[PDB]
Design a protein around this ligand. Structure first.
Ligand SMILES: *[C@@H]1O[C@H](CO)[C@@H](O)[C@H](O)[C@H]1NC(C)=O
Lengths: 45, 50
């Protein structure tokens, strides 16, 4: 509204391998231009 | 592991796999042979590069 721009999101996965598999499977298949990532509330480095 | 592509990031992926699967991985050729700066301490990924 400030100035043709879709958006998609998905929650964090417990398994890093499963998270990466979900990432591309869903995010990549949609042909995104950037991915926003944030740390979960759990204290995992 | 041995690949023919020149994509560097593939090597990075292998290290990540070694971090989670706890299986030793050896780079041979192509992207895998590319040496990364610092691997994760849990990862057991090795390369033949310099
Ligand atoms: C916009 O992204 C959403 C996310 O699920 C998707 O369902 C939708 O198909 C996208 N819009 C179009 C018209 O591609």
């Amino acid at each position: 509204k400030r100035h043709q721009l879709n958006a998609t999101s998905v929650t964090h996965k417990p398994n890093a391998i499963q998270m990466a598999l979900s990432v591309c499977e869903d995010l990549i298949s949609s042909q995104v231009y950037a991915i926003l990532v944030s740390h979960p509330p759990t204290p995992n480095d | 592991f041995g690949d023919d592509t020149d994509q560097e990031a593939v090597a990075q992926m292998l290290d990540f796999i070694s971090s989670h699967t706890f299986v030793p991985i050896l780079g041979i050729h192509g992207g895998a042979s590319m040496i990364m700066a610092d691997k994760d301490p849990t990862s057991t990924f090795f390369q033949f590069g310099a």
